[PDB]
Amino acid sequence: MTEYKLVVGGGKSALTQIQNHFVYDIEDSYRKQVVIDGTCLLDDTAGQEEYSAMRDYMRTGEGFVFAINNTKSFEDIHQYREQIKRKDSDDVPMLVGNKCDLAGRTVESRQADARSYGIETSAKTRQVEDAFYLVREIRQH
Amino acid sequence: MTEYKLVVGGGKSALTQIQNHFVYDIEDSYRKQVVIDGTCLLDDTAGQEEYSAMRDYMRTGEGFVFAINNTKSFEDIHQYREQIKRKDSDDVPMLVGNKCDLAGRTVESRQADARSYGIETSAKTRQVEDAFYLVREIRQH
Numbered sequence: 001m002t003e004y005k006l007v008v009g010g011g012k013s014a015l016t017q018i019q020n021h022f023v024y025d026i027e028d029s030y031r032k033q034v035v036i037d038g039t040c041l042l043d044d045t046a047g048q049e050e051y052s053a054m055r056d057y058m059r060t061g062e063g064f065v066f067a068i069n070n071t072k073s074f075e076d077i078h079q080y081r082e083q084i085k086r087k088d089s090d091d092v093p094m095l096v097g098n099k100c101d102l103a104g105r106t107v108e109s110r111q112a113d114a115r116s117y118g119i120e121t122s123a124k125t126r127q128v129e130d131a132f133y134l135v136r137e138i139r140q141h
Numbered sequence: 142m143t144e145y146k147l148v149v150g151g152g153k154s155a156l157t158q159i160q161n162h163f164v165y166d167i168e169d170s171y172r173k174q175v176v177i178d179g180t181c182l183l184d185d186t187a188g189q190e191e192y193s194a195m196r197d198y199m200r201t202g203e204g205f206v207f208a209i210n211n212t213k214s215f216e217d218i219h220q221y222r223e224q225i226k227r228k229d230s231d232d233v234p235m236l237v238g239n240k241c242d243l244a245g246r247t248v249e250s251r252q253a254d255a256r257s258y259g260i261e262t263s264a265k266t267r268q269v270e271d272a273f274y275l276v277r278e279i280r281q282h
């Protein structure tokens with residue numbers, strides 16, 4: 001069957017609410033069998049420092065986060081996109097607005113103007129599949 | 142604020158579960174105030190016979206259904222697309238798979254190959270915003 005490659009930008013893991021739940025805790029692959037929009041097995045990073053050339057996990061994926069309070073994390077976006085574009089392609093199937101149930105955010109929705117490149121998720125309520133089912137882009141790429 | 146124009150293909154109305162609920166019953170405009178992915182007011186047809194040049198409600202919309210058991214309704218898709226493309230545009234922001242909790246379907250997921258044009262919804266369970274929030278396409282058109 002169709003087997004989907006998913007490789008997700010300090011609440012990414014969080015998302016992966018696979019295990020239906022809500023989790024201070026190197027690498028996790030995960031495998032579930034859904035149906036999306038009509039038999040689909042799904043196939044989680046840590047963006048801390050150390051991995052940089054282990055990252056080039058950008059090679060084996062099809063579809064590819066910030067915290068709405070963390071502007072430097074908004075600002076980490078631009079370092080990222082570059083090493084998956086340089087999957088020598090200027091268009092990869094690919095923006096995660098996590099931590100949206102919170103009450104003092106430094107990255108304004110407005111500013112996530114995404115549209116230059118080509119969702120606001122709460123891993124704490126479940127406002128987690130609306131971002132992932134990215135599978136739909138895989139499905140037209 | 143941003144005011145979104147929405148004009149939806151015998152379970153369309155159904156969808157519009159606006160009123161949070163689940164409904165044998167000419168035209169309904171509807172107005173709700175959400176947030177999608179970061180202040181968004183939302184702005185329902187009957188595809189029976191009579192309206193055809195009243196339809197040309199294709200002029201005042203930005204974003205624009207079948208029943209998974211109804212192949213002739215799958216087959217009504219192609220009549221439709223044409224009069225909103227002829228909004229003299231070959232690319233309009235715009236496929237609804239309704240009646241997906243049921244158990245004998247004549248339109249196979251597989252065949253909704255959508256991808257030529259450019260979701261499977263249950264208005265009976267709530268498997269209703271995943272199709273609509275179409276608003277995201279409006280937002281990059």
Ligand SMILES: Nc1nc2c(ncn2[C@@H]2O[C@H](COP(=O)(O)OP(=O)(O)OP(=O)(O)O)[C@@H](O)[C@H]2O)c(=O)[nH]1
Pocket residue numbers: 009010011012013014015023024025045046047048098099100101102121122123124125
């Ligand atoms: N309130 C709130 N906290 C969250 C949410 N998602 C994650 N967190 C918290 O933020 C912290 C980090 O969550 P993790 O899932 O470990 O984050 P990380 O993104 O994995 O860090 P890297 O793996 O290096 O990218 C934890 O204490 C989480 O509970 C969310 O949506 N709401």
Ligand SMILES: Nc1nc2c(ncn2[C@@H]2O[C@H](COP(=O)(O)OP(=O)(O)OP(=O)(O)O)[C@@H](O)[C@H]2O)c(=O)[nH]1
Pocket residue numbers: 150151152153154155156164165166186187188189239240241242243262263264265266
């Ligand atoms: N089981 C089931 N029946 C549904 C669903 N959605 C609609 N129906 C039923 O199908 C029938 C038609 O629903 P309506 O919402 O009136 O359908 P319609 O699409 O409005 O007809 P037009 O307005 O001419 O396009 C009703 O008896 C609904 O309850 C659904 O997802 N599940």
Ligand SMILES: [Mg+2]
Pocket residue numbers: 010011012013014044045046047
């Ligand atoms: Mg993580």
Ligand SMILES: [Mg+2]
Pocket residue numbers: 151152153154155185186187188
């Ligand atoms: Mg209807």
